[PDB]
Design an enzyme around this catalytic site. Structure first.
Site, PDB file in Angstrom:
ATOM      1  N   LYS C 154       0.807  -1.221   0.000  1.00 35.31           N
ATOM      2  CA  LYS C 154       0.000   0.000   0.000  1.00 35.31           C
ATOM      3  C   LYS C 154       0.836   1.266   0.000  1.00 35.31           C
ATOM      4  CE  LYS C 154      -1.659  -1.333   3.813  1.00 35.31           C
ATOM      5  NZ  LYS C 154      -1.577  -2.687   4.395  1.00 35.31           N
ATOM      6  N   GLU C 180      -0.480   5.628  11.130  1.00 32.39           N
ATOM      7  CA  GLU C 180       0.627   4.822  10.595  1.00 32.39           C
ATOM      8  C   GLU C 180       1.919   5.011  11.335  1.00 32.39           C
ATOM      9  OE1 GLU C 180       0.816   2.163   8.401  1.00 32.39           O
ATOM     10  OE2 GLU C 180      -1.333   1.960   8.886  1.00 32.39           O
ATOM     11  N   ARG C 181       3.050   4.674  10.703  1.00 31.04           N
ATOM     12  CA  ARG C 181       4.323   4.763  11.437  1.00 31.04           C
ATOM     13  C   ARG C 181       4.888   6.163  11.497  1.00 31.04           C
ATOM     14  NH1 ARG C 181       3.921   0.077   8.417  1.00 31.04           N
ATOM     15  NH2 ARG C 181       4.833  -1.839   9.290  1.00 31.04           N
TER      16      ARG C 181
END
EC number: 7.1.2.2
Lengths: 492, 467, 466
Positions: C154, C180-181
């Site tokens: 993704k 997310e990260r």
């Protein structure tokens, strides 16, 4: 003695959250009545409890706060109905959303009315032509009939419905008022840009004139999405109860169930199978029973419904899918496998059915497609049983030769609904064996050539088949003559 | 007594009585309504408040509304003047032909026949349907069940049985439509009339009808079967006649209950069902029965949710039957109608001592070969057919032909099959199969055996196909 | 107005008010804290109490603590001065570059554009990615979604698209990192700086960044999307600008919702998700759209839990996209990147009257052969190809060559493919696939087609393979 806020016709919000108001007071409200919020926001009285009324809100509950005054309306939920709505895009309550002005409505109708009983109806007998060979030949739809369009995401379910709405110009632009069909298209949980795309195409096809579009999209409150189907239904009964003919598409009944499930859980009603209310069957039965054919004693009008349901991993045995398949008068099952394979519509012959049978078909069509359905079923089987040419006889070689040719003829593109006599001409060619020696790959091209020929040159045979509504002995002879000869010149 | 409505939530209405609490099962009538609304008392919540199930729509009810205890469970007009008529859950004519002037009235709730009232006569009831007759014979006075998921043939099969049996039957018939399609009650009523089973001018009616379709609130659906069954018990006991009972579809009685169950405050049992499913089914199924007084021949359509025969409902009903016809979408899908599953259908009379060894050896003979072929199916699928022993590629043959010879064009499905309906006599059936099994037609093509009545039509069809 | 903290459970803070109860969605500021702690009202429990969702960790709060009605919903700096800046759920800069000095402020909760405001122009957006362009083409101002289980592609696909599309886009872009990260935000920011889309010297930045990552409490993750969203809405309507909106990952917003939902006291729906899942996705997804005023091309990564696309989250998202790129672990494991499932990706533009019939026929051509290969696979699986028909074996050859030709090296994935990134022009894709279909390369080996751009490179690779 300010006596405007007595607790019998008014109440005050005890609490509000997630679209559910717990109103205090409202001592005289009736179950299912509409109430009003200080903010002009309407709601509906679903739970009448000892100490509170659970009100479902038709809009953003952000404008509602504890303490607000809630007023009865004295009216059980209803909506605008009638010819004024044609060509207009309304929300789940009737309000216009095409910013094209107010609706000039003179009639209203309760969204929730029981379907006419046993006595007021008559067997479905008049065809409801889709324009799609596959459908009109194998799973015929009659007026007053409920036929389900079911399949996974993107298998083409809406297309069936659009082509159908578009095919109705034929009669609507005509003279005869009995053959006319007003359409209703209810979008539920869908996306506004998709609907906007939808109403554009309808406009470009000159179909809006006879269509009403009730829209209850993705951001609309759960209760609007929930109601939307009943709303749209009621607008269709206006035509049904007045000797006119209506067609309603519920696109789709899956997103409504979710809406119902949400509304329902937020009211704290114990979840049931799969998390849905124990009455989701009822949720859809109540609605679809309303599509019906009334007897001449009641105007002979009708309501035909084409509800859509989305399966997952083509699994039609699924609980919801079967719940709805067990209410309608048949189903059109679309498979992604068939679709990718080139078979569009992806109608799965074997799994689709019409509980009305040929009674919803013209004799011309019955004549040509009377046994085709079980023939194709039996063809799909042997086609599988010889995916290894197991010392196959002739009767089955003939069976596979017809099966393939007939499969090609049922194929069809989009937006080009055919006229009944056009279908009869082309199926005829196949069903009679005149194409058993043509090459499968040729069939599609041949049908475009052949149809061209007869439409242009022979409209006398088309107008007769169309008119007589049957295939007489001479028409059948003029046809044999045309196909065989054109076919030959065609295979030069 | 007079109670007041204190809470309304769907089909469930709670009522508070000041003096005199109506017993459980009692029917109460809501005052102030254009139409008759009956509430069946379901529970005693305590505090002189009863929880009830509505027999109709609850729209427009108001907290505080008045309710009178009728003093008795729902009671309906029972007797011969019900024949040729159409009734409600609550016994009201719905055919617009006026009152039903019966001498007596019966409460839809009643105890099932005692053990010492049971009968054990077992007579085959020939139907004209190859499959049923051959493999899962129905029995006169027995309990029959047609199992099937959505759209596999339950009703059509019930339709051809009404034609091949109800029509000649000298006795009454009661057809109770429970939670099915309204369109369908209108198709049947008008068919009964066009064929004189229903007579609107005289008293020659041989069928009473009761309906509580899918457009009704759970409550009505949880009771029509009772009303239907009650009408039938009268002709069984008070007249002593041979009754034919058709119910389509009894699953609806159980779905009705599951739909209000949560509003009755119950922890769900498995699959969402109510915890009282089996007992609820038991006290009902136990009345649908032949006794020493009269005989009932019940044909019940049984819906199978998600096509799963293990679903608590279909699953719980097998025990109430003497014969079962299991229909399958996998068979139907192939174009084989009626889509009965030859290896999942059974009858308590499939006994050599009852149908005879010729009947019995053929049936079992046909089942072995279909089983034998079922097992090979998945394997020749991949590994192909060459390696198979001529001994084994003959059973593939015969099986595929039997599979077809078991289909039949029904007289009530010409609109479906495009074929004239055929009714085959028990001996034409036994013989036809006996010969296929005997190798006497290994020359004709399979297709010759598809959609035909008697074996001679398969032979004729071979020629017609011969070109 | 000043209320008092009555109860605290994770991110659900219940506050009672004596005079003046704040409306739902209003942001309250907790008093007595080293940093800002915004509470968003969620519902009126009655008894002058409001149940709220904290926007940051709630440790340290105390019952009876004072809370102040801000008088409005979370509002954030909107305008061109957000371009090149990194901001919070609650709009404060987090790039240590000072205050975002804007003229206007926008509230993160707005209604979705009306029906009459919708647009229906359908223009194809070419990306240079073979599979996407050929089979499920994106569209300008359209809504695209990349579905993918963990570690399938993704983000790499969003990066490559940022590279291939965002980089040469006249107009602005908004990247919203949701759940997310953090390292990724950092990887991107610095990369954006480097290629100059973020300029810390001039006012020439073309990207505004909003982040609410994997380390935030649920409520923050539940609202950052709304925040990135709002920034984008400003450029669309207040400047009639053509926007690009990237979100990684929108599945996280729904997950965040499921985290607080029990705390809000709701009976759960299926799979433990909140009963309000669809409406929550809906009133949010419906603002991410092109209109008559402006265009929003939005690319959203959609994380699929346990790889189950029937999961309520992903399942409910299909209906909001115009084009979908469904990534597959099975394909990825074969070494095909991007791991796009060709028979599962779709696009409302795959219409002959929009991509032309040449395009429409190659597209359906490729799918038909892969669908056919797909059914043979069961038997190929036990018995291999031997027993296959000469004809069937040709579909298989072609299918395996089409399958390989659908893969391609991304600049962004050069460190892993070991090959130089390629960008193939649409006509090159339509073509290369025609020929394959047409049997013009039945002589080349499969391996020739793996990891290449244009067909011309597939022929070459074949020579090198000798």
């Amino acid at each position: 003695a300010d006596t405007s806020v007595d607790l019998e016709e008014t109440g005050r919000v005890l609490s509000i959250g997630d679209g559910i108001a717990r109103v205090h007071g409202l001592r005289n409200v009736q179950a299912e009545e509409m109430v009003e919020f200080s903010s002009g926001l309407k709601g509906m009285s679903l739970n009448l409890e000892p100490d509170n009324v659970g009100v479902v809100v038709f809009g953003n509950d952000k404008l509602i706060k504890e303490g607000d005054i809630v007023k009865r309306t004295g009216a059980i939920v209803d909506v605008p109905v009638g010819e004024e709505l044609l060509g207009r895009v309304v929300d789940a309550l009737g309000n216009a959303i095409d910013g094209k002005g107010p609706i000039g409505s003179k009639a209203r109708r309760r969204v929730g009315l029981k379907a006419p009983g046993i006595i007021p109806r008559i067997s479905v007998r008049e065809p409801m032509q889709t324009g799609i060979k596959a459908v009109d030949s194998l799973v015929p739809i009659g007026r007053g009939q409920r036929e389900l369009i079911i399949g996974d995401r993107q298998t083409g379910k809406t297309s069936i419905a659009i082509d159908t709405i578009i095919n109705q110009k034929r009669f609507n632009d005509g003279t005869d008022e009995k053959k006319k069909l007003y359409c209703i298209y209810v979008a539920i949980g869908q996306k506004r840009s998709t609907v906007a795309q939808l109403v554009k195409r309808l406009t470009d096809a000159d179909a809006m004139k006879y269509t009403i579009v009730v829209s209850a999209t993705a951001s609309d409150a759960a209760p609007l999405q929930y109601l939307a189907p009943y709303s749209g239904c009621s607008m269709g009964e206006y035509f049904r109860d007045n000797g006119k003919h209506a067609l309603i598409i519920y696109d789709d009944l899956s997103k409504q169930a979710v809406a119902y499930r949400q509304m329902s859980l937020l009211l704290r009603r114990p979840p049931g199978r799969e998390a849905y209310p124990g009455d989701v069957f009822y949720l859809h039965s109540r609605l679809l029973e309303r599509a019906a054919k009334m007897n001449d004693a009641f105007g002979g009008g009708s309501l035909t419904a084409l509800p859509v349901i989305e399966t997952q991993a083509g699994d039609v045995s699924a609980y919801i899918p079967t719940n709805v398949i067990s209410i309608t008068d048949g189903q059109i099952f679309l498979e992604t496998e068939l679709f990718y394979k080139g078979i569009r519509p992806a109608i799965n012959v074997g799994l689709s059915v019409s509980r009305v049978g040929s009674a919803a078909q013209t004799r011309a069509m019955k004549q040509v497609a009377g046994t085709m359905k079980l023939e194709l079923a039996q063809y799909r089987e042997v086609a599988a049983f010889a995916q290894f040419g197991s010392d196959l006889d002739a009767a089955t070689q003939q069976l596979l030769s017809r099966g393939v040719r007939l499969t090609e003829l049922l194929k069809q593109g989009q937006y080009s609904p055919m006229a009944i006599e056009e279908q009869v001409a082309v199926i005829y060619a196949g069903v009679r064996g005149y194409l058993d020696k043509l090459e499968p790959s040729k069939i599609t091209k041949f049908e475009n050539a052949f149809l061209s020929h007869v439409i242009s040159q022979h409209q006398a045979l088309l107008s007769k088949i169309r008119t007589d509504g049957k295939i007489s002995e001479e028409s059948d002879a003029k046809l044999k003559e045309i196909v065989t000869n054109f076919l030959a010149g065609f295979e030069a | 007594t007079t109670g007041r409505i204190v809470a309304v939530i769907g089909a469930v209405v709670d009522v508070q009585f000041d003096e005199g609490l109506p017993p459980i099962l009692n029917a109460l009538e809501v005052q102030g309504r254009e139409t008759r609304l009956v509430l069946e008392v379901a529970q005693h919540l305590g505090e002189s408040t009863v929880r009830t199930i509505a027999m109709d729509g609850t729209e427009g009810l108001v907290r505080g509304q008045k309710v009178l205890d009728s003093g008795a469970p729902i009671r309906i007009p029972v007797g011969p003047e019900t024949l040729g008529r159409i009734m409600n859950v609550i016994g009201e004519p719905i055919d617009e032909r006026g009152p039903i002037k019966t001498k007596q009235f019966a409460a839809i709730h009643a105890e099932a026949p005692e053990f010492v009232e049971m009968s054990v006569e077992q007579e085959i009831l020939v139907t004209g349907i190859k499959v049923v007759d051959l493999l899962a014979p129905y029995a006169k006075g027995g309990k029959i069940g047609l199992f099937g998921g959505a759209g596999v043939g339950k009703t059509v099969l019930i339709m051809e049985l009404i034609n091949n049996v109800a029509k000649a039957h000298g006795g009454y018939s009661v057809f109770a439509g429970v939670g099915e399609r309204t369109r369908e009650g209108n198709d049947l009523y008008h068919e009964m009339i066009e064929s004189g089973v229903i007579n609107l001018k005289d008293a020659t009616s041989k069928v009473a009808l009761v309906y509580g379709q899918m457009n009704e609130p759970p409550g009505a659906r949880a009771r029509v079967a009772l009303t239907g069954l009650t009408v039938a018990e009268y002709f069984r006991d008070q007249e002593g006649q041979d009754v034919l009972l058709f119910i389509d579809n009894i699953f609806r009685f159980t779905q009705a209950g599951s739909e209000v169950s949560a509003l009755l405050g119950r922890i769900p049992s498995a699959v969402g069902y109510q915890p009282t499913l089996a007992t609820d089914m038991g006290t009902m199924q136990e009345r649908i029965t032949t006794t020493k007084k009269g005989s009932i021949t019940s044909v019940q359509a049984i819906y199978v949710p998600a096509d799963d025969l293990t679903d608590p409902a279909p699953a719980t009903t097998f025990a109430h039957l003497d014969a079962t016809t299991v229909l399958s979408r996998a068979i139907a899908e192939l174009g084989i109608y009626p889509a009965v599953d030859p290896l999942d259908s059974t009858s308590r009379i499939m006994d050599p001592n009852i149908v005879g060894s010729e009947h019995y050896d053929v049936a079992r003979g046909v089942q072995k070969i279909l089983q034998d072929y079922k097992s090979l199916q998945d394997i020749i699928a991949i590994l192909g057919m060459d390696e198979l022993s001529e001994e084994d590629k003959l059973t593939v043959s015969r099986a595929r032909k039997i599979q077809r010879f078991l289909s039949q064009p029904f007289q009530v499905a010409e609109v479906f099959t495009g074929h004239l309906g055929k009714l085959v006599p028990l001996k034409e059936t036994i013989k036809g199969f006996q010969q296929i099994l005997a190798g006497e037609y290994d020359h004709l093509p399979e297709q010759a055996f598809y959609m035909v009545g008697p074996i001679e039509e398969a032979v004729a069809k071979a020629d017609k196909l011969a070109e």
